[PDB]
Amino acid sequence: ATSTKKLHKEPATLIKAIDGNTVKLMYKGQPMTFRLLLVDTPEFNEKYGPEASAFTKKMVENAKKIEVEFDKGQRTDKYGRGLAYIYADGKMVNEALVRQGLAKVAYVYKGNNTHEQLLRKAEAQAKKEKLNIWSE
Ligand SMILES: Cc1cn([C@H]2C[C@H](OP(=O)(O)O)[C@@H](COP(=O)(O)O)O2)c(=O)[nH]c1=O
């Protein structure tokens, strides 16, 4: 039997937080806009939108260390954005948004679904707790 490589975390530097599910980072010396895998936040004009933007922003702006983890599948979306799990001092931004009820699990493609179960677990806790998007 042979294996493939285990996902891994690569460092990157904050350029700018964009919105609840998009951050721009300096990655190997070039800017790349990253779309968070497996999540969707409300838009900035919808309810909870500003809160989702602010959450992501604080998390990445406060971080000493930001890391990018690509999944096993597609690395870019149709609009050119990198698709990744983003970590701020070892805490996954994708997961923290879902746990807070500021993102739903969404855009789940089987090619790129490594942390699906971890996020669904977060979503189930946020729904039990009636947070934000689940409050009604
Ligand atoms: C998470 C994710 C989003 N996307 C695309 C689908 C959505 O475009 P379409 O609606 O044109 O299909 C877009 C949503 O981004 P935002 O939620 O940032 O607006 O991100 C991917 O293509 N793959 C993914 O894994």
Q: Is the CB of 134 under 6 A from ligand 1?
A: no
What is the C-alpha separation between 8 and 94, in angstroms, rounded? 16
Query: What are the DSSP E strand ranges found in 20-56?
Result: 22-27, 30-36, 39-40
What is the C-alpha separation between 97 and 117, in angstroms, rounded? 15
Q: Could you write out the three-class secondary structure of 61-125? A: HCCCCEEEECCCCCCECCCCCEEEEEEECCEEHHHHHHHCCCCEECCCCHHHCCCHHHHHHHHHH
> Which CATH topology does 1-136 take?
OB fold (Dihydrolipoamide Acetyltransferase, E2P) (2.40.50)
Pairing of strands 10-19, 22-27: antiparallel
Where does residue 78 rank: exposed (0-12), middle (13-18), buried (19+ CB within 10 A)? exposed
What is the C-alpha separation between 82 and 30, in angstroms, rounded? 12
Resolution of the experimentally solved model in angstroms = 1.5
What is the C-alpha separation between 100 and 103, in angstroms, rounded? 8
Tokens of 90: 């070892």
Tokens of 12: 């990157």
Which run of H or E residues covers position 60?
helix 49-61
What is the C-alpha separation between 51 and 20, in angstroms, rounded? 8
**Catalytic one among 10, 75, 81, 99?**
81
Residue 81 a catalytic site member: yes
Nearest to 41 by CA among 108, 123, 98: 98
- Domain positions in the chain are 1-136
Determination approach: X-ray
